């Protein structure tokens, strides 16, 4: 059937050409029967983990920037609870508007979100457009999880997703107690009197 317990939606946001979609395909189920990207914009991918003996279903919506869909993207951040700003260390002008993406996403997403920040294409570490310690600091006074992804090793990004779903889980972890259902008696022949 379906049988999962919770379902989160997590946007991937950034500038175009920073390498979000190639980052998405390697670590998660992909190319199921999705028509494509740009036909409607913002492709959807799914990931199924379990936390604390609860099953979690996560939908990742890699936002697409083409200027034409800018009005459409606003409506797609409505209700968005998990977030990931991706930036590349090779090019440098994405980091000038990474703060703008954070501002636009603090606006009209939820009451509270948990935004990660991830450096794609660390295979070109020598070509470092921005120092990692500055982005690490900018994550530190913005309450953000910070990652550096090789794009050739998927362990880092997979670890980031597991910890992000943990922090967003405890945030919404509704209290649960028990569903045991063992209390049985009263098998008589009913000498009733009304």
């Amino acid at each position: 059937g379906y049988d999962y317990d919770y379902l989160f939606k997590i946007v991937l946001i950034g500038d175009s050409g920073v390498g979000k979609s190639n980052l998405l395909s390697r670590f998660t189920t992909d190319e199921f029967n999705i028509e494509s990207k740009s036909t409607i914009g913002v492709e959807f991918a799914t990931r199924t983990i379990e936390v604390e003996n609860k099953k979690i279903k996560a939908q990742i919506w890699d936002t697409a920037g083409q200027e034409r869909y800018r009005a459409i993207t606003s409506a797609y951040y409505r209700g968005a609870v998990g977030a990931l700003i991706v930036y590349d260390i090779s090019k440098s002008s994405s980091y000038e508007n990474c703060n703008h993406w954070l501002t636009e996403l603090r606006e009209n997403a939820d009451d509270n979100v948990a935004v990660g920040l991830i450096g794609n294409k660390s295979d070109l570490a020598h070509l470092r457009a921005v120092p990692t310690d500055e982005a690490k600091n900018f994550a530190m006074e913005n309450q953000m999880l910070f990652t550096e992804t090789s794009a050739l090793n998927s362990d880092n990004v997979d670890k980031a997703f597991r910890e992000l779903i943990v922090a967003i889980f405890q945030m919404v972890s509704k209290h649960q107690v028990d569903l045991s259902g063992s209390g049985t008696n009263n098998m008589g022949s009913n000498g009733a009197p009304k």
């Binding site: 999962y4 409607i40 959807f44 799914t46 509704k174």
Partner: protein, 163 residues
């Protein structure tokens, strides 16, 4: 008119309920329904933004669907710049947005304007069962699939009372 599959999607994209009624087939694996529901939310967003030189009254009635019933009087809708009904050869898809933002999708295996009139008086009677049997449910958190088992055979009786 007829309904063959209830789909209930969230106010934030991905679905919270679907139950194929007497489909007798599983063309789509359960996972696909999520990308279908998000695709319908996206094209419901896109069909707002294109509108021609317009910028200018959806009043249903009581047809006695389901056999006291749920309401008596003509009412209004809430979405104008948005997708309302798809029409194809095998099926016909109705959709109904509530005011709060909670879209209800009904796939219909009976094809070929009065189908809107009979359709939304069923899709509000599924909204009344939603607000009566899922909202008063402390095991049901917000933003979670509808894991209640009373909601299934409260709507199965009304749809087999239809068809």
């Amino acid at each position: 008119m007829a309904i063959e599959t209830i789909l209930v999607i969230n106010k934030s994209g991905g679905l919270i309920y679907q139950r194929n009624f007497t489909n007798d087939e599983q063309k789509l694996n359960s996972n696909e329904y999520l990308i279908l529901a998000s695709t319908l939310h996206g094209v419901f967003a896109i069909a707002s933004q294109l509108t021609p030189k317009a910028l200018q009254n959806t009043i249903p009635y009581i047809p006695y669907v389901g056999m006291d019933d749920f309401f008596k009087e003509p009412f209004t809708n809430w979405n104008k710049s948005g997708l309302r009904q798809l029409c194809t050869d095998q099926f016909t898809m109705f959709i109904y947005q509530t005011l709060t933002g909670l879209k209800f999708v009904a796939i219909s295996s009976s094809v070929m304007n009065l189908a809107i009139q009979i359709a939304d008086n069923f899709l509000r009677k599924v909204y009344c069962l939603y607000s009566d049997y899922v909202m008063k449910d402390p095991s049901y958190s917000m933003e979670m699939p509808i894991r209640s088992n009373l909601f299934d055979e409260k709507v199965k009786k009304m749809v087999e009372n239809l068809q």
